[PDB]
Nucleic acid binder design. Sequence first.
DNA 1: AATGTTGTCTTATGCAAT
DNA 2: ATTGCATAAGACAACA
DNA 3: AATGTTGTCTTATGCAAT
DNA 4: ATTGCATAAGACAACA
Lengths: 213, 210, 210, 214, 210, 212, 269, 269
Amino acid sequence: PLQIWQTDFTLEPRMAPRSWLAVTVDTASSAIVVTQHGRVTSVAVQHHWATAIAVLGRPKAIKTDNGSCFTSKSTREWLARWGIAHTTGIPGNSQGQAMVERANRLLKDKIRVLAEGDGFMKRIPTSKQGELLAKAMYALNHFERGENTKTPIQKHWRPTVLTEGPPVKIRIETGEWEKGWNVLVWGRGYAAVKNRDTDKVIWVPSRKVKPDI
Amino acid sequence: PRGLGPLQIWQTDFTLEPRMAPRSWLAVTVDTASSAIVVTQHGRVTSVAVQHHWATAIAVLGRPKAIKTDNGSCFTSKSTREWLARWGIAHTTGIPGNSQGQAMVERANRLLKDKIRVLAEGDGFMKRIPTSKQGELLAKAMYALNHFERGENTKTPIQKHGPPVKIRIETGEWEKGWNVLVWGRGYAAVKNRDTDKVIWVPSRKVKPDI
Amino acid sequence: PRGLGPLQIWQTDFTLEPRMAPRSWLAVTVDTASSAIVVTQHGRVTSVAVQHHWATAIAVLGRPKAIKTDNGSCFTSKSTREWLARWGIAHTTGIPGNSQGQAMVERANRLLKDKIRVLAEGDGFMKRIPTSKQGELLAKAMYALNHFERGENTKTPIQKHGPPVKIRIETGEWEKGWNVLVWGRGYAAVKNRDTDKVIWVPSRKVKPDI
Amino acid sequence: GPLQIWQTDFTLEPRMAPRSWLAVTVDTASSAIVVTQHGRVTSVAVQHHWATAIAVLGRPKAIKTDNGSCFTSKSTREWLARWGIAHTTGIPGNSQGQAMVERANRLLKDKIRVLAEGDGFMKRIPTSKQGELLAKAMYALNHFERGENTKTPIQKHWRPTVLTEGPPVKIRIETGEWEKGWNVLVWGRGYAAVKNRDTDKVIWVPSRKVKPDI
Amino acid sequence: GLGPLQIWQTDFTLEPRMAPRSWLAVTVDTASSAIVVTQHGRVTSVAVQHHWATAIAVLGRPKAIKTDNGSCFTSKSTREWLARWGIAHTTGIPGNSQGQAMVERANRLLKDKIRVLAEGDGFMKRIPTSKQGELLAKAMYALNHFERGENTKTPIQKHWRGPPVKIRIETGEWEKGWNVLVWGRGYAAVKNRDTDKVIWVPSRKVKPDI
Amino acid sequence: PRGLGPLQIWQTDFTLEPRMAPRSWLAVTVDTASSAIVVTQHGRVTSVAVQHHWATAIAVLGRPKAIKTDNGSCFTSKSTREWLARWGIAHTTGIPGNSQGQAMVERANRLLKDKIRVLAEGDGFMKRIPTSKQGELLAKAMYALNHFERGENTKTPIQKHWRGPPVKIRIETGEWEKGWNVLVWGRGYAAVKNRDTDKVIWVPSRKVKPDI
Amino acid sequence: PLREAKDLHTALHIGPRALSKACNISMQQAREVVQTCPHCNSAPALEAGVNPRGLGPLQIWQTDFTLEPRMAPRSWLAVTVDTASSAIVVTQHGRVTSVAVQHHWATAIAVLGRPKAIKTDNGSCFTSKSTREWLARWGIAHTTGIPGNSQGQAMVERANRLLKDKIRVLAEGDGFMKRIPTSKQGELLAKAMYALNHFERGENTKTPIQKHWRPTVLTEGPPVKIRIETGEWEKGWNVLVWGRGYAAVKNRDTDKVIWVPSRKVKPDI
Amino acid sequence: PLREAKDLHTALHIGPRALSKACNISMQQAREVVQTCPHCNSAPALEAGVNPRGLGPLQIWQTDFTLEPRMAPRSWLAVTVDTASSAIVVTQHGRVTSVAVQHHWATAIAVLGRPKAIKTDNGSCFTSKSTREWLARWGIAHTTGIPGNSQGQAMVERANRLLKDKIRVLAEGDGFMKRIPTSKQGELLAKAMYALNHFERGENTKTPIQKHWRPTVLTEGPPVKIRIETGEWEKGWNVLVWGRGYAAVKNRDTDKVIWVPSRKVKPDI
DNA sequence: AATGTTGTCTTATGCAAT
DNA sequence: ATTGCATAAGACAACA
DNA sequence: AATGTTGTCTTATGCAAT
DNA sequence: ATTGCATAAGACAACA
Ligand SMILES: CCN1C[C@H](C)n2c(c(O)c3c(=O)n(Cc4ccc(F)c(Cl)c4)nc(C(=O)NC)c32)C1=O
Ligand SMILES: CCN1C[C@H](C)n2c(c(O)c3c(=O)n(Cc4ccc(F)c(Cl)c4)nc(C(=O)NC)c32)C1=O
Ligand SMILES: [Mg+2]
Ligand SMILES: [Mg+2]
Ligand SMILES: [Mg+2]
Ligand SMILES: [Mg+2]
Ligand SMILES: [Zn+2]
Ligand SMILES: [Zn+2]
């Protein structure tokens, strides 16, 4: 995850004036991000992945087309600043843009679904655009698509729920710090610690405790 | 919306119900202010059916100050007139169906009938209801229409019918004359002694006296 | 002996009054904390009569949680047991005449009989009540015992329908009879059972009562 | 000894209308004069006077005065008993209960006029400058010298010295023995500086290592 | 006054001490109170020129000089002296309130010093030929560098004539554009960056910049 | 040796400049620390002319705690000592022409001669000047001497009249560079200024180190 | 002799030390004569119950508004923090309109998911009819604090202060002393987002994000000692969470979870 | 690898802990890269020099006015404290006019003696011409604090709060809830005066009055360790007075008396 | 109706090295 | 032991 | 211009008794 | 040794 991303700028008439729609999609998780744009600009170019980075993280590479605002020096300098590897492609190639096909299809489907669901047919109210975008974002990212046994979130974050503190070594009476223990609570000068085998919780002074490995 | 309080002005009328047959007659007493109701049961129109009605009505919801009625013959009967003389509450006549005397009792009859029909269809009786189920059905309709608020209002129709602490204010003083009602984990509601009103204040903003 | 809160504890019994023939089989039900008394007349002991009085008693007092009753072939019958289950109310049946729970209901029955008597002979119906007068006389006696008085209480029953701690005085003793309503970091706010007076006492001057 | 017997009377001052009634309280062991003034000769005003005089000077042991209406009246009597001061009366003008009162009265009557001519007031000073005049007269009579000794009443009254040493405390030595002959200087936190009463040698010592002496 | 070396006021006075050369030549600075006096026993163009320049010598180059319409003050020699000096000359009566009166008061104080010094040495009205310059110069020293009046800085210090910090204000904000002049032990005088006005402020209400 | 303090010690001597004739005589006084010079250019040399020069000198500049002059009959007169007692200033005497405190006076006199000559040749008078423009020449020379800097020295004689310790700061490079004097020092950091650029910066208290 | 002591306190209201030193009286009598006067002891017990918190992620959320002068002409910002995980979501608007909260929460949902409850102050548009109706449509709780103390929302308020500090740091490190160009608004906001959520703060060894997506909750806490309200420490409960500020404890039998200040709890044995 | 750390701080302004954890770096480089940014540390050094005090009795005095509702129609009170011995004198007036200020001092003068300095806030009548000339006629100094902080006279203000507390205790301990009859004003003031001056306050073993008339002052203090502003503790001074709040220390050669925060001094050896 | 929070900073402590 | 360090513990602020 | 103060309260601690 | 105590140390508030 957070390895390769794609992107494209797609039209849609119902969100006039800011009818320019930006897309960016991951590969390993197929997570989506969308931003409105009044007009496609190399600066609006900046504005998108900055938002995309915050919600997902910093990827390792990005692949796109040869767009006008995709190729100016501003974007190159900014991606260099963040240390992310650009890789342009053909405006429509499949060996490059490959997940964005399913992306665009699902995004337009969901946008149409919601736009007609909330009693609109040709123009979303200007105050109600971001609402629909956020709803589509949440629906397509937190819910499985088609056969998917997991939503994009589950693949992207591995959202398990651990219940044990980190492995920690405790100063034993011989002076050494035996590993295999996990802290439970960091109180005042005292931290309750358990043994991974006996499952006994013991209060030990904060001076005799240090993490494992 | 008259500004007078509860227990002041009443309104009485009977009604017909083929469901409740053979005891097919019903009467309800309603207040102009509280809109609270008392329901009796009978099968024939009599001066004592209202007497059964008034006794049930006066006991549940207190004594009335004035009652507006119609020109029914049994309402001026000797028995009920002696009853009212023993009561001490005045009796007034009028025209049967004006907007000043019969203000809400007819609509109360209609609403009570609608409740009885909807509950009869809820528990499974369409045409008529046996005399065994009448008491509990009337009780359920009464509880739904009285214990629960109906429509919109700041208080329910039944609602219509502390150690001393010092709290701070925005000025920064410690005024006196309040009593805590509820003692929350980090909050409290205090009732003033004179203006007898409740306001919620954080626990870290109040200290007692004495 | 005084309860903890209304609409949480109930109790009932069975009474027979020969003056109410042939529907002489009453069904008394009274609360403990709120001490609200209600009855419903019928002419035999049966599951039908028990569930009718109970369902009527549900809405005239409040939705019940757990009612304590006595042993018999009516409450323990299958229909009334499933009625208890359906209405979500428990059963705490005991000895038919147990002193811990039925002394109050027996006293209430004696009071009800005495009131029915006194008011009936005040009206002029001495021995037995006719059909058209039974409901009115029952309502009359209930009215006599709704909102005038109970007989001894300064806080009437239907008007209502802290752990103990020892405190300290300058005398040299630790006196009991105080329940803390409100607790503070450097004091306590206790109130006596008898004087029902709230006084801010320093935390040093209190300790648990037993 | 100081603060054992007091004396009191009134004095009518026409130069000081409308509050023309003036009370004077005098110590005997130090001749410290305290005065306060009231328009009307009632009770409440004169216990106000006595309270002020007590506040400025302290609580005496006995007060001698005349047999005036208020001086032995109840209010004054239980007020004084609650204060716990021994009242004394006498002949209204006797040379024992009023031995020094008249001397203080003539001294004050000279001083008030002296100052009134000093600021050029002849008949009656306006109500504004009355209190200032009284305060100036009190300062002149008390802190200065009108006798021919080397001790002002304040020097007589409070025993005013300038100490150099704190209270003596018995320090504990490391072997565990308490030891007097030491007087603390500075009560710094944790460490208190104590000086050897003989060698004038100071030393820093922990707090609990020292306890007061006697 | 706003700044030194701006306004100079020269007038002549007579002191009978140094007769027969009893005439004097004195210049006064309005904004600094610095004074120069050169003995000149004859009011002439040479005498006024010699003292005028000696006034510049003692203190420094001015931008203007205010005098009266004396024929020895607007003469061609004096006009050319001022022209080659590049300063301004303004006439007067003299005797105005705001201006041309501080010169007279300064003359009064200068002579005050000469009389007190002469009577300290032992001369009443006539002084030896080896004493007039001594007395006048001693008076210059006494008046100039010893503070006279109720100021904190001497008149010579009243002649010609920090790191940036952020201060809190009543709002609670912390504005920039400030510099510290004097650093007290618990206090500080701060000057604005632009207005260059100095106010004092508690040391606990300032934090530095960058 | 100039770290004594301004308005502390003054040095006086007589030099005979060839332009002041016929009022040739001239008494000169200088300050070791403040580098402030004041003269009067009298027409006679004597104790009366000496103290008239001295008492105007102290009015112009300030109150010295000591005034030093070469020994001789021109300064040891009883009237001069009565003047000193009237001003309560200690006095000492030295060799008439020693290097203890008179080389500075000699160089100051030569500087006065050069400045006077160049100013006179600028005005238009080569040898002699009328008795009316002597004072203006003196005033212009004094303004050049005092207000404006002499030579490459930044501190004008004014700056040394009525006026933090040097410290070294911690640079990221590894240089504890000098040229820094704290002005206002706080408990988290300081406010230093340089000696030549004279720019104020705030540097952490761990970023500083005193000088010597 | 405490009769004169009682008289002295009644007529003078003297402190216990002076009373002891002025009538040859000791510790006890000084105390029980000084506490007799009601006027000598009025204030010195002001209770401090200080405990808002949620337990697991997407349970309790907080929200306020911010006036940011640099964000002109779109200064108003809506900030949302998940109490369990301390993650932050913000959005930029021009009016305090209910529609802005409509949008701000919607984006917050898209990034973090669906929480259960949202605590907020009684803002002019928080309790609006449309806002409440739409919130019910989404089906999440809403609980306003006491009407007037912007202190029950202390978490979102502190997050507000921190975000203002961070955004000002970025802006004036980018060379913008007074305000930001309309172009750079979104870049600054997103950079602040990535800085805050994806990097741990202070000293905790856990990033807010992986705190949120990988929460750790104890199923059975350790035994502790508890300052039960009666005034003295009691033995026999377990602490669920013990934050730097405040902690939550659980009963051994009733299994109640309550929020108490950390001072009320100390470790068992 | 500190190059990426420098970039990350410059473009992102990260705390040293996260920078160390995110680029495999340690204590030092994390520090000296986080202090390079001028924006990462702006305020956190606010100087606090807090020391008004006098040395001997009748040397320094303070004064302020008080609005006491119970004292109507003469609510205004003038309070004076001797900083050396903490004695108090209060006088009652109807207006804040200069004449009242004239009256208050000489009454205090007659009780405590003649002081030398009277610090006060720049009241509308303290700086009045008549007050100034009369004070000069008496011939003692007059120093005003900074114009606006009623905090430099903290001693008179604290004694003001104490006196208001005591007078409230006396008034409502006698049966006057809201205000005082004219017949009770003077004796209430006198009793309040007597209580504070002639009795101990807190724990100090020396009465304020016997402090004033029988003061003790050390002629030579003991050696201490002194936080000279040089950064650390300098050795070689002696403390004259060390109050619980704050202290004064003396040089051994310069013979300087200085009022210094008590944290800046600790005992020597 | 429904309660302070915590990053940043300063001070103190103990161990490990010298 | 003395110095320095690595750590921990404690304190302040401000946000409509 | 020229600066926090301290009584009151609370908690922690060591000794003395048990 | 445990509990209790006597003291010491530290914290809080509010004065126009
Ligand atoms: C110019 C006439 N004048 C006053 C100005 C109006 N003032 C006067 C006062 O007496 C006070 C005053 O007592 N305090 C109380 C206070 C606040 C904080 C502290 F730290 C402390 Cl030792 C005292 N405040 C102010 C004030 O205004 N702003 C804080 C005040 C006054 O006499
Ligand atoms: C009615 C709509 N409304 C607000 C009222 C006006 N308000 C609102 C706020 O957001 C704040 C706010 O943030 N703070 C800052 C603050 C002050 C002290 C603290 F302890 C914390 Cl934790 C926060 N104060 C106020 C305020 O009421 N009086 C200072 C406030 C708001 O949204
Ligand atoms: Mg808010
Ligand atoms: Mg807020
Ligand atoms: Mg003031
Ligand atoms: Mg004040
Ligand atoms: Zn008291
Ligand atoms: Zn930075």
